Short mmCIF file of C-alpha atoms and ligand atoms in Angstrom, two decimals:
data_model
loop_
_atom_site.label_atom_id
_atom_site.label_comp_id
_atom_site.label_asym_id
_atom_site.label_seq_id
_atom_site.Cartn_x
_atom_site.Cartn_y
_atom_site.Cartn_z
CA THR U 5 0.00 0.00 0.00
CA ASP U 6 3.02 2.28 -0.10
CA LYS U 7 2.68 5.38 -2.22
CA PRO U 8 4.78 5.57 -5.40
CA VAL U 9 6.38 8.85 -4.28
CA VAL U 10 7.92 9.57 -0.88
CA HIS U 11 8.60 13.27 -0.15
CA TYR U 12 11.26 14.06 2.46
CA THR U 13 10.61 17.68 3.40
CA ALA U 14 10.17 20.51 5.89
CA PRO U 15 7.96 23.64 5.80
CA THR U 16 10.41 25.97 4.02
CA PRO U 17 10.70 27.84 0.68
CA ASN U 18 12.39 24.74 -0.83
CA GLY U 19 10.41 22.04 0.91
CA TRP U 20 6.97 23.28 -0.18
CA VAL U 21 7.62 23.15 -3.88
CA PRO U 22 7.60 19.42 -4.78
CA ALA U 23 4.43 19.01 -2.68
CA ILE U 24 2.78 21.87 -4.61
CA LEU U 25 3.58 20.13 -7.90
CA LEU U 26 2.38 16.76 -6.59
CA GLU U 27 -0.96 18.28 -5.60
CA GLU U 28 -1.23 20.12 -8.95
CA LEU U 29 -0.64 16.84 -10.76
CA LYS U 30 -3.27 15.06 -8.68
CA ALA U 31 -5.83 17.76 -9.44
CA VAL U 32 -5.30 17.27 -13.18
CA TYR U 33 -4.56 13.57 -13.60
CA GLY U 34 -6.03 12.05 -10.44
CA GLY U 35 -2.59 11.07 -9.13
CA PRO U 36 0.02 10.20 -8.10
CA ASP U 37 -0.29 10.10 -4.35
CA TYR U 38 2.63 10.68 -2.07
CA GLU U 39 3.88 9.92 1.42
CA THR U 40 5.37 12.77 3.47
CA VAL U 41 8.34 12.27 5.76
CA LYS U 42 8.84 15.41 7.84
CA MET U 43 12.56 15.94 8.42
CA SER U 44 14.30 18.01 11.03
CA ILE U 45 16.52 20.76 9.64
CA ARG U 46 17.66 21.81 13.11
CA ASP U 47 21.42 21.48 13.60
CA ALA U 48 20.76 20.87 17.32
CA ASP U 49 19.08 17.59 16.34
CA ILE U 50 22.04 16.20 14.40
CA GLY U 51 22.80 12.58 15.46
CA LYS U 52 19.91 12.26 17.84
CA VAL U 53 16.85 12.12 15.56
CA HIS U 54 16.30 9.54 12.81
CA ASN U 55 14.33 11.91 10.53
CA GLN U 56 17.04 14.55 10.41
CA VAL U 57 18.80 15.70 7.25
CA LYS U 58 22.35 14.73 8.32
CA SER U 59 21.44 11.19 9.37
CA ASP U 60 23.44 8.78 7.17
CA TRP U 61 20.51 6.78 5.82
CA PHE U 62 19.12 9.98 4.29
CA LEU U 63 22.43 10.79 2.59
CA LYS U 64 21.77 7.77 0.34
CA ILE U 65 18.77 9.76 -0.97
CA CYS U 66 20.15 13.31 -0.77
CA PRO U 67 23.99 13.33 -0.57
CA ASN U 68 23.88 17.02 0.34
CA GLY U 69 21.95 16.28 3.56
CA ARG U 70 19.18 18.81 2.86
CA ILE U 71 15.47 18.74 2.04
CA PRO U 72 13.56 18.29 -0.16
CA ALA U 73 14.20 14.95 -1.79
CA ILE U 74 11.98 12.28 -3.19
CA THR U 75 12.08 8.60 -3.95
CA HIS U 76 9.95 7.30 -6.79
CA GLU U 77 9.65 3.52 -6.48
CA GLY U 78 13.08 3.58 -4.86
CA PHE U 79 14.76 6.00 -7.32
CA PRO U 80 16.06 9.05 -5.43
CA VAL U 81 15.95 12.63 -6.67
CA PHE U 82 17.40 15.62 -4.80
CA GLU U 83 17.49 19.40 -5.48
CA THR U 84 14.11 21.20 -5.72
CA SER U 85 14.28 22.07 -9.42
CA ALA U 86 15.53 18.61 -10.43
CA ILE U 87 12.65 17.05 -8.44
CA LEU U 88 10.14 19.26 -10.26
CA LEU U 89 11.61 18.31 -13.66
CA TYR U 90 11.60 14.63 -12.75
CA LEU U 91 8.02 14.63 -11.57
CA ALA U 92 6.89 16.57 -14.64
CA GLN U 93 8.62 14.22 -17.08
CA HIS U 94 7.15 11.11 -15.35
CA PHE U 95 3.63 12.33 -14.49
CA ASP U 96 2.71 15.40 -16.58
CA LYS U 97 1.90 13.54 -19.78
CA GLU U 98 -0.21 16.30 -21.24
CA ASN U 99 2.29 19.05 -20.43
CA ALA U 100 -0.01 21.00 -18.16
CA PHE U 101 2.87 22.29 -15.99
CA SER U 102 5.98 21.69 -18.05
CA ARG U 103 7.37 21.80 -21.57
CA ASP U 104 8.40 18.76 -23.58
CA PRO U 105 12.12 18.53 -24.45
CA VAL U 106 11.53 16.71 -27.78
CA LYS U 107 8.57 18.58 -29.24
CA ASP U 108 9.44 21.99 -27.74
CA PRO U 109 13.25 22.13 -27.41
CA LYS U 110 13.30 25.93 -27.33
CA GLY U 111 10.48 26.23 -24.81
CA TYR U 112 12.05 23.50 -22.67
CA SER U 113 15.35 25.40 -22.74
CA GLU U 114 13.51 28.56 -21.61
CA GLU U 115 12.03 26.60 -18.70
CA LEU U 116 15.46 25.31 -17.70
CA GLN U 117 16.96 28.81 -17.92
CA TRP U 118 14.37 30.25 -15.50
CA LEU U 119 14.71 27.27 -13.13
CA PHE U 120 18.49 27.68 -13.07
CA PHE U 121 18.12 31.44 -12.62
CA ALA U 122 16.00 30.84 -9.49
CA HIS U 123 18.23 28.00 -8.30
CA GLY U 124 21.45 30.00 -8.56
CA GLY U 125 20.08 33.48 -7.81
CA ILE U 126 16.84 33.91 -5.81
CA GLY U 127 17.16 30.81 -3.58
CA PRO U 128 20.83 31.27 -2.63
CA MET U 129 20.79 35.05 -2.28
CA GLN U 130 17.45 35.39 -0.47
CA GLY U 131 18.64 32.54 1.74
CA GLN U 132 21.78 34.54 2.61
CA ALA U 133 19.68 37.59 3.37
CA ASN U 134 17.71 35.38 5.78
CA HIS U 135 20.98 34.07 7.22
CA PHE U 136 22.34 37.50 8.13
CA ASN U 137 19.03 38.50 9.81
CA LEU U 138 18.16 35.31 11.63
CA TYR U 139 21.23 33.15 12.22
CA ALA U 140 24.43 35.18 12.12
CA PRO U 141 25.31 35.91 15.77
CA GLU U 142 26.30 39.53 15.04
CA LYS U 143 24.70 42.28 13.00
CA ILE U 144 26.97 42.70 9.96
CA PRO U 145 25.66 45.63 7.91
CA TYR U 146 27.98 44.99 4.96
CA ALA U 147 26.47 41.53 4.51
CA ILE U 148 22.89 42.47 5.31
CA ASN U 149 23.07 45.22 2.69
CA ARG U 150 24.85 42.98 0.15
CA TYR U 151 22.13 40.34 0.23
CA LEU U 152 19.14 42.70 0.48
CA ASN U 153 20.47 44.69 -2.50
CA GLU U 154 21.09 41.49 -4.45
CA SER U 155 17.65 40.11 -3.60
CA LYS U 156 16.09 43.43 -4.79
CA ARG U 157 18.05 43.18 -8.07
CA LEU U 158 16.88 39.61 -8.66
CA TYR U 159 13.25 40.51 -7.86
CA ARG U 160 13.48 43.33 -10.39
CA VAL U 161 14.57 40.81 -13.04
CA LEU U 162 11.58 38.64 -12.06
CA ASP U 163 9.13 41.55 -11.99
CA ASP U 164 10.26 42.66 -15.47
CA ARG U 165 9.78 39.11 -16.81
CA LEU U 166 6.26 39.08 -15.40
CA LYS U 167 5.25 42.35 -17.11
CA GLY U 168 2.42 41.59 -19.54
CA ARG U 169 1.98 37.96 -18.38
CA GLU U 170 0.31 36.06 -15.59
CA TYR U 171 3.13 33.43 -15.24
CA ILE U 172 6.82 33.28 -16.06
CA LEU U 173 6.39 31.19 -19.25
CA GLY U 174 2.86 32.37 -19.98
CA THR U 175 1.05 29.33 -18.63
CA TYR U 176 1.56 28.31 -14.97
CA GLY U 177 4.15 25.62 -14.50
CA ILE U 178 7.18 24.36 -12.69
CA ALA U 179 9.22 27.56 -13.09
CA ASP U 180 6.49 29.45 -11.22
CA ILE U 181 6.28 26.75 -8.56
CA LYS U 182 10.03 26.84 -7.89
CA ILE U 183 10.24 30.62 -7.49
CA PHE U 184 6.92 30.91 -5.61
CA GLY U 185 8.31 29.02 -2.58
CA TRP U 186 10.77 31.88 -2.03
CA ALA U 187 8.66 34.77 -3.29
CA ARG U 188 5.86 34.10 -0.83
CA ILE U 189 8.30 34.71 2.06
CA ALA U 190 9.93 37.75 0.46
CA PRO U 191 8.18 40.21 2.84
CA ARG U 192 9.66 38.40 5.85
CA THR U 193 13.09 38.70 4.28
CA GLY U 194 12.71 42.47 4.13
CA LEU U 195 11.65 42.90 0.50
CA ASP U 196 8.57 45.00 -0.15
CA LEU U 197 6.41 43.10 -2.64
CA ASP U 198 4.52 46.36 -3.30
CA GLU U 199 7.81 47.46 -4.99
CA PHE U 200 7.49 44.50 -7.37
CA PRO U 201 3.78 44.66 -8.24
CA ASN U 202 3.97 42.04 -11.01
CA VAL U 203 5.61 39.66 -8.59
CA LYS U 204 3.05 40.56 -5.88
CA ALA U 205 0.03 39.81 -8.09
CA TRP U 206 1.67 36.59 -9.27
CA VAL U 207 2.26 35.42 -5.70
CA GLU U 208 -1.39 36.16 -4.87
CA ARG U 209 -2.64 34.34 -8.01
CA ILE U 210 -0.66 31.24 -7.00
CA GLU U 211 -1.38 31.37 -3.28
CA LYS U 212 -5.13 31.10 -3.97
CA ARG U 213 -4.82 27.76 -5.85
CA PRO U 214 -6.27 24.87 -3.81
CA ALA U 215 -3.43 22.59 -4.82
CA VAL U 216 -0.87 25.14 -3.63
CA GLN U 217 -2.53 25.31 -0.22
CA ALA U 218 -2.70 21.51 -0.03
CA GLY U 219 0.98 21.19 -0.96
CA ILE U 220 2.11 23.79 1.59
CA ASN U 221 -0.04 22.26 4.32
CA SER U 222 1.33 18.76 3.66
CA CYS U 223 4.70 19.91 4.98
CA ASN U 224 3.51 20.75 8.51
CA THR C 5 34.20 31.32 -41.08
CA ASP C 6 30.60 30.59 -40.01
CA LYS C 7 29.94 30.75 -36.30
CA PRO C 8 26.41 29.58 -35.37
CA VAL C 9 27.03 29.93 -31.64
CA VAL C 10 28.08 33.23 -30.07
CA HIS C 11 29.47 32.90 -26.52
CA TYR C 12 29.31 36.00 -24.31
CA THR C 13 31.79 35.34 -21.57
CA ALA C 14 34.70 36.31 -19.29
CA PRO C 15 37.58 34.30 -17.82
CA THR C 16 35.85 33.13 -14.66
CA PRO C 17 34.63 29.85 -13.07
CA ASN C 18 31.29 30.31 -14.82
CA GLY C 19 32.56 31.82 -18.10
CA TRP C 20 34.93 28.95 -18.86
CA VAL C 21 32.41 26.16 -18.77
CA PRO C 22 30.41 26.59 -22.00
CA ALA C 23 33.68 27.15 -23.90
CA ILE C 24 35.02 23.89 -22.49
CA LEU C 25 31.94 22.05 -23.74
CA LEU C 26 32.12 23.77 -27.17
CA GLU C 27 35.73 22.61 -27.54
CA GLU C 28 34.89 19.07 -26.37
CA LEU C 29 32.12 18.97 -28.98
CA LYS C 30 34.42 20.35 -31.69
CA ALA C 31 36.98 17.60 -30.96
CA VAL C 32 34.40 14.81 -31.28
CA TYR C 33 32.03 16.16 -33.98
CA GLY C 34 34.04 18.81 -35.85
CA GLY C 35 31.70 21.60 -34.65
CA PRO C 36 29.98 23.82 -33.77
CA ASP C 37 32.35 26.69 -34.39
CA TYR C 38 31.68 29.75 -32.26
CA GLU C 39 32.45 33.43 -31.76
CA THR C 40 33.60 34.65 -28.39
CA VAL C 41 32.51 38.10 -27.13
CA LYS C 42 34.55 39.02 -24.09
CA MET C 43 32.35 41.01 -21.66
CA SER C 44 33.32 43.29 -18.82
CA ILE C 45 31.84 42.05 -15.56
CA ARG C 46 33.08 45.09 -13.62
CA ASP C 47 30.66 47.57 -12.05
CA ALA C 48 33.27 50.32 -12.69
CA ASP C 49 32.70 49.82 -16.43
CA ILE C 50 28.90 50.17 -16.35
CA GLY C 51 27.89 52.62 -19.10
CA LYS C 52 31.51 53.16 -20.21
CA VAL C 53 32.13 50.02 -22.32
CA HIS C 54 29.73 48.55 -24.95
CA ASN C 55 30.64 44.92 -24.06
CA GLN C 56 29.55 45.16 -20.42
CA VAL C 57 27.03 42.91 -18.69
CA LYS C 58 24.55 45.61 -17.62
CA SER C 59 24.28 47.12 -21.11
CA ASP C 60 20.70 47.21 -22.33
CA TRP C 61 21.48 45.34 -25.56
CA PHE C 62 22.87 42.45 -23.54
CA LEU C 63 19.87 42.32 -21.22
CA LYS C 64 17.93 41.09 -24.31
CA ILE C 65 20.14 37.99 -24.31
CA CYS C 66 20.66 37.58 -20.55
CA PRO C 67 18.00 39.35 -18.47
CA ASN C 68 20.11 38.82 -15.36
CA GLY C 69 22.96 40.92 -16.77
CA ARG C 70 25.67 38.31 -16.13
CA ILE C 71 27.91 36.02 -18.19
CA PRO C 72 27.94 33.49 -19.68
CA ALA C 73 25.22 33.49 -22.25
CA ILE C 74 24.97 32.19 -25.78
CA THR C 75 22.98 32.76 -28.89
CA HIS C 76 22.40 29.92 -31.29
CA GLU C 77 21.11 31.04 -34.61
CA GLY C 78 19.69 33.94 -32.64
CA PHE C 79 18.06 31.91 -29.80
CA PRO C 80 19.41 33.11 -26.43
CA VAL C 81 20.39 30.89 -23.50
CA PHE C 82 21.59 32.16 -20.13
CA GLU C 83 22.75 30.38 -16.91
CA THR C 84 25.85 28.15 -17.16
CA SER C 85 24.09 24.82 -16.53
CA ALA C 86 21.19 25.61 -18.88
CA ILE C 87 23.72 26.51 -21.62
CA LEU C 88 25.51 23.17 -21.10
CA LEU C 89 22.20 21.29 -21.35
CA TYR C 90 21.13 23.21 -24.48
CA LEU C 91 24.41 22.67 -26.29
CA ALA C 92 24.38 19.00 -25.37
CA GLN C 93 20.82 18.54 -26.62
CA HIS C 94 21.56 20.31 -29.90
CA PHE C 95 25.11 19.09 -30.67
CA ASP C 96 25.99 16.00 -28.63
CA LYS C 97 24.16 13.61 -30.94
CA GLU C 98 26.01 10.51 -29.73
CA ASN C 99 25.74 11.44 -26.04
CA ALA C 100 29.47 11.56 -25.47
CA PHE C 101 29.13 14.21 -22.72
CA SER C 102 25.51 14.05 -21.67
CA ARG C 103 22.57 11.72 -21.15
CA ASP C 104 19.41 11.69 -23.32
CA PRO C 105 16.13 12.49 -21.51
CA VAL C 106 14.08 10.04 -23.57
CA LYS C 107 16.41 7.07 -23.80
CA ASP C 108 17.88 7.41 -20.31
CA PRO C 109 15.40 9.20 -18.02
CA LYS C 110 17.17 8.02 -14.85
CA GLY C 111 20.63 9.03 -16.00
CA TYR C 112 19.32 12.33 -17.33
CA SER C 113 17.69 12.99 -13.96
CA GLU C 114 20.95 12.23 -12.17
CA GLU C 115 22.77 14.62 -14.46
CA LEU C 116 20.18 17.35 -13.66
CA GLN C 117 20.49 16.62 -9.94
CA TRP C 118 24.28 17.11 -9.96
CA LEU C 119 24.05 20.19 -12.17
CA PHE C 120 21.46 21.71 -9.83
CA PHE C 121 23.59 20.73 -6.82
CA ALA C 122 26.53 22.65 -8.31
CA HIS C 123 24.31 25.53 -9.45
CA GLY C 124 22.67 26.07 -6.05
CA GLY C 125 25.55 24.90 -3.84
CA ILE C 126 29.15 25.07 -5.04
CA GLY C 127 28.85 28.07 -7.41
CA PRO C 128 26.85 30.35 -5.07
CA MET C 129 28.72 29.39 -1.87
CA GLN C 130 32.24 29.27 -3.29
CA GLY C 131 31.38 32.56 -5.04
CA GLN C 132 30.54 34.07 -1.62
CA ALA C 133 33.78 32.69 -0.20
CA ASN C 134 35.66 34.39 -3.02
CA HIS C 135 33.74 37.60 -2.42
CA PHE C 136 34.57 37.81 1.29
CA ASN C 137 38.06 36.31 1.18
CA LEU C 138 39.37 37.90 -2.01
CA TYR C 139 37.33 40.89 -3.18
CA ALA C 140 35.33 42.63 -0.42
CA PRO C 141 36.68 46.07 0.64
CA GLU C 142 36.47 45.00 4.26
CA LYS C 143 37.63 41.81 5.97
CA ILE C 144 34.76 40.09 7.82
CA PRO C 145 36.07 36.93 9.51
CA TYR C 146 32.60 35.56 10.32
CA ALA C 147 31.62 35.65 6.65
CA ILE C 148 34.94 34.42 5.33
CA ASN C 149 34.70 31.43 7.69
CA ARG C 150 31.03 30.76 6.99
CA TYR C 151 31.56 30.45 3.25
CA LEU C 152 34.91 28.66 3.44
CA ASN C 153 33.29 26.14 5.79
CA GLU C 154 30.23 25.73 3.59
CA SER C 155 32.47 25.30 0.53
CA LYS C 156 34.37 22.59 2.42
CA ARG C 157 31.11 20.83 3.30
CA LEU C 158 30.04 20.90 -0.36
CA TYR C 159 33.45 19.63 -1.50
CA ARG C 160 33.21 16.79 1.01
CA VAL C 161 29.91 15.78 -0.62
CA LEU C 162 31.69 15.85 -4.04
CA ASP C 163 34.76 14.01 -2.72
CA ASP C 164 32.62 11.20 -1.25
CA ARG C 165 30.70 10.94 -4.54
CA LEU C 166 33.97 10.60 -6.42
CA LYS C 167 35.24 7.77 -4.17
CA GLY C 168 35.58 4.69 -6.41
CA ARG C 169 35.05 6.84 -9.53
CA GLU C 170 36.92 8.98 -12.03
CA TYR C 171 33.90 11.21 -12.95
CA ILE C 172 30.70 12.17 -11.19
CA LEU C 173 28.38 10.08 -13.35
CA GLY C 174 30.89 7.46 -14.50
CA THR C 175 31.88 8.98 -17.83
CA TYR C 176 33.10 12.57 -18.18
CA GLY C 177 30.36 14.97 -19.08
CA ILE C 178 28.53 18.19 -18.46
CA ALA C 179 28.14 17.64 -14.71
CA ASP C 180 31.91 17.44 -14.37
CA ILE C 181 32.42 20.42 -16.65
CA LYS C 182 30.09 22.63 -14.62
CA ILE C 183 31.78 21.93 -11.31
CA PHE C 184 35.30 21.87 -12.74
CA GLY C 185 35.23 25.60 -13.50
CA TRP C 186 34.87 26.25 -9.76
CA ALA C 187 36.96 23.35 -8.45
CA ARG C 188 40.07 24.39 -10.41
CA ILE C 189 40.14 27.65 -8.42
CA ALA C 190 39.27 26.09 -5.05
CA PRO C 191 42.94 26.46 -3.87
CA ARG C 192 42.69 30.17 -4.58
CA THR C 193 39.40 30.33 -2.69
CA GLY C 194 41.19 28.82 0.28
CA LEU C 195 40.48 25.09 0.20
CA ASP C 196 43.33 22.66 0.59
CA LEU C 197 42.55 20.06 -2.06
CA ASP C 198 44.79 17.58 -0.28
CA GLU C 199 41.84 17.31 2.16
CA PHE C 200 39.67 16.28 -0.82
CA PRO C 201 41.98 13.86 -2.67
CA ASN C 202 39.23 12.54 -4.96
CA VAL C 203 38.31 16.03 -6.04
CA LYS C 204 42.01 16.80 -6.48
CA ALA C 205 42.69 13.85 -8.81
CA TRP C 206 39.49 14.65 -10.73
CA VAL C 207 40.54 18.29 -11.26
CA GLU C 208 43.94 17.08 -12.48
CA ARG C 209 42.57 14.59 -15.01
CA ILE C 210 40.17 17.18 -16.45
CA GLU C 211 42.75 19.99 -16.52
CA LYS C 212 45.03 17.84 -18.74
CA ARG C 213 42.42 17.59 -21.55
CA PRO C 214 43.37 19.64 -24.62
CA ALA C 215 39.75 20.68 -25.15
CA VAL C 216 39.60 21.99 -21.60
CA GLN C 217 42.72 24.12 -22.14
CA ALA C 218 41.33 25.37 -25.49
CA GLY C 219 38.03 26.34 -23.87
CA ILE C 220 39.65 28.13 -20.97
CA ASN C 221 42.04 29.99 -23.26
CA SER C 222 39.21 31.14 -25.56
CA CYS C 223 37.86 33.36 -22.75
CA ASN C 224 40.99 35.56 -22.61
N1 GDS P 1 19.68 23.77 -3.55
C1 GDS P 1 18.81 22.97 -2.61
C2 GDS P 1 18.59 23.75 -1.33
C3 GDS P 1 17.83 22.94 -0.24
C4 GDS P 1 17.96 23.61 1.08
O1 GDS P 1 18.61 24.65 1.27
N2 GDS P 1 17.32 22.95 2.09
C5 GDS P 1 17.37 23.46 3.45
C6 GDS P 1 15.98 23.80 4.00
S1 GDS P 1 15.13 25.05 2.94
S2 GDS P 1 15.38 26.96 4.25
C7 GDS P 1 16.51 27.97 3.18
C8 GDS P 1 17.96 27.44 3.22
N3 GDS P 1 18.62 27.76 4.48
C9 GDS P 1 19.19 26.83 5.24
O2 GDS P 1 19.17 25.66 4.90
C10 GDS P 1 19.84 27.36 6.50
C11 GDS P 1 20.88 26.38 7.08
C12 GDS P 1 22.13 26.12 6.20
N4 GDS P 1 22.91 25.02 6.78
C13 GDS P 1 22.97 27.39 6.10
O3 GDS P 1 24.02 27.42 6.75
O4 GDS P 1 22.57 28.31 5.37
C14 GDS P 1 18.70 28.19 2.11
O5 GDS P 1 19.16 29.35 2.28
N5 GDS P 1 18.79 27.54 0.95
C15 GDS P 1 19.51 28.17 -0.20
C16 GDS P 1 19.01 27.75 -1.54
O6 GDS P 1 17.85 27.27 -1.64
O7 GDS P 1 19.79 27.97 -2.47
C17 GDS P 1 17.90 22.39 4.40
O8 GDS P 1 17.58 21.16 4.31
N6 GDS P 1 18.71 22.85 5.38
C18 GDS P 1 19.26 21.96 6.42
C19 GDS P 1 20.75 22.03 6.59
O9 GDS P 1 21.37 22.86 5.92
O10 GDS P 1 21.24 21.24 7.42
C20 GDS P 1 17.46 22.70 -3.31
O11 GDS P 1 17.05 23.54 -4.16
O12 GDS P 1 16.86 21.63 -3.02
N1 GDS P 2 23.99 31.52 -12.00
C1 GDS P 2 24.77 32.20 -13.08
C2 GDS P 2 25.96 32.95 -12.45
C3 GDS P 2 26.74 33.77 -13.50
C4 GDS P 2 27.69 34.72 -12.78
O1 GDS P 2 27.84 34.79 -11.57
N2 GDS P 2 28.35 35.60 -13.62
C5 GDS P 2 29.32 36.58 -13.12
C6 GDS P 2 30.75 36.28 -13.56
S1 GDS P 2 31.35 34.65 -13.11
S2 GDS P 2 32.70 35.08 -11.24
C7 GDS P 2 31.78 34.32 -9.91
C8 GDS P 2 30.58 35.20 -9.50
N3 GDS P 2 30.99 36.46 -8.84
C9 GDS P 2 30.62 37.69 -9.32
O2 GDS P 2 29.91 37.79 -10.31
C10 GDS P 2 31.13 38.84 -8.48
C11 GDS P 2 30.22 40.09 -8.65
C12 GDS P 2 28.75 39.97 -8.16
N4 GDS P 2 28.00 41.17 -8.52
C13 GDS P 2 28.69 39.82 -6.63
O3 GDS P 2 28.77 40.87 -5.95
O4 GDS P 2 28.52 38.67 -6.15
C14 GDS P 2 29.75 34.36 -8.54
O5 GDS P 2 30.04 34.32 -7.32
N5 GDS P 2 28.71 33.70 -9.05
C15 GDS P 2 27.87 32.90 -8.18
C16 GDS P 2 27.27 31.62 -8.87
O6 GDS P 2 27.84 31.13 -9.86
O7 GDS P 2 26.23 31.18 -8.34
C17 GDS P 2 28.97 37.95 -13.68
O8 GDS P 2 28.61 38.10 -14.87
N6 GDS P 2 29.10 38.95 -12.79
C18 GDS P 2 28.82 40.33 -13.23
C19 GDS P 2 27.90 41.05 -12.31
O9 GDS P 2 27.47 40.46 -11.28
O10 GDS P 2 27.59 42.21 -12.65
C20 GDS P 2 25.32 31.11 -14.04
O11 GDS P 2 25.52 29.97 -13.58
O12 GDS P 2 25.50 31.43 -15.22
#
């Protein structure tokens, strides 16, 4: 009775996103279902909790010792954007949320470019902004300013891409889902989404999807 | 003298990597030939040099205003890893350096996972280590140590992956190429590669390849 997909996750800008896609897929195709394994991302739990991202058994699934990761009938996939691509290729047969590499090589490339932009830019830089507010023991203005300025620059790139559209590649798909995990916590990072009104409306359009709520809530 | 790919680049851990793949492809297939446009990545040059990453004309090719980017018969691709994937899909017809998404969905997924690992882990974090240790106008020991330590953690993940192997996914390919651009300057960043002897031997075997040297040199 095991589900075909197991999602190892935590309620975070990265952990929400495969669950969002899984719920979107279910709403369209009727499946697949998934099992959720809630993992500790607290360094104070290292060694002493089985479901903890540094525990060795989990490194066989995600060698980086971070969430999210999935297994699909035993096959492991780590890194948010790679998980989204995997799930789309295996379950999104009508291309509702993703572009086909064979029939749409240029559109597929576009999708990869925006995923990699988020994966190398928004996620890392907004995460460093969060680091220097929440976790660094001292206030370090050089670093706080560096990462807030860089996050603002990246959100301007995103806002400009959203001008004249409702979604990054026109129709809602996995590039929106990846970025949305971070964009919905942008205010708490110190960005003003009212300064990026295309981004703000896009976050609101996605937040109101029932599958998005179900995916976020599955991580709690 | 036809050049169907134009590579907008600079001699940097990201700039080298598409040129390396282009030269690997040229050695196996006899093409594609390419033009190199050397771009200033310096803020001091903004508005003062035509070939500068924040120039409006370039934002039409790379909306993030960073190198590398390519055009292929006019079609733009930005983000190192997305460029590698595009060039592989379009020119690596015998899959000498890359896995096919249709014929090898598992291997293709693994390749994406390691590219995304590098793109969200090694490049961003080693780039921050370089910023604080090498380029910032003030020395901030907390930040230097944070990003040197995180780089070391990421290199330990890579070193353990390379145990028992010569290349990340068995045969040399685009996942190695992506990380190699950063790993070859790890000593400069501040990592002692003797502490990562699998990474060290892997850097050495890749550095010796004539196509690698040709790609690196093309960015000067
Ligand atoms: N590139 C990976 C990133 C996954 C990731 O960062 N997972 C986090 C929780 S998401 S919460 C956001 C996360 N922050 C952290 O993980 C903070 C702790 C970390 N050790 C540090 O020192 O920064 C971050 O900034 N991410 C940057 C990015 O997405 O590029 C995790 O498991 N952390 C546990 C641990 O590190 O032990 C992906 O896309 O899947
Ligand atoms: N994710 C992109 C990154 C491309 C990139 O960083 N390009 C750099 C040169 S490569 S040199 C390595 C680069 N450092 C820089 O670009 C230093 C300047 C920057 N503004 C800063 O303050 O961080 C870096 O750390 N990159 C992190 C990563 O790869 O994730 C660039 O054009 N800089 C000009 C500019 O910013 O105006 C990719 O993979 O293509």
